[PDB]
């Protein structure tokens, strides 16, 4: 809990919403209070599953 606290202490963790997926392995992610972003793999989760 101490170490995990340290990784979530600075920025915490956000809540993403995928508006669209791209073939470049980069997935468009939109945050509600914020604008639209896009972020690359993410190898633990398969692209076809997104």
């Amino acid at each position: 809990l101490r170490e995990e606290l340290q990784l979530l202490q600075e920025q915490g963790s956000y809540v993403g919403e995928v508006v669209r997926a791209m073939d470049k392995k980069k997935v468009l992610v939109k945050v509600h209070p914020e604008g639209k972003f896009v972020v690359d793999v993410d190898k633990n989760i398969d692209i076809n599953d997104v």
């Binding site: 809990l1 101490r2 995990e4 606290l5 979530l8 202490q9 600075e10 915490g12 963790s13 956000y14 809540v15 945050v31 509600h32 209070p33 914020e34």
Partner: protein, 70 residues
């Protein structure tokens, strides 16, 4: 030393705290909760109580920086 560890988990984060709006418990040890600022956050839940007082819809106190479920 385990009883002394309980004080290690109660030390964090102590005071002060920020109010947050709980959404739903996605899985064990972590759930998504809304900040009073309006930003929904993916948060690790404190280890002691994960269940009885969680409730689908309840106000919950979080840390300033981490926004951790306490």
């Amino acid at each position: 030393e385990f009883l002394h560890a309980q004080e290690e988990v109660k030390r964090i984060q102590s005071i002060p705290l920020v109010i947050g709006q709980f959404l739903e418990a996605v899985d064990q040890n972590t759930a998504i909760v809304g900040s009073t600022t309006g930003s929904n956050y993916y948060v690790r839940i404190l280890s002691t109580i994960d269940r009885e007082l969680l409730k689908p819809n309840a106000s919950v106190a979080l840390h300033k920086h981490s926004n951790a479920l306490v």
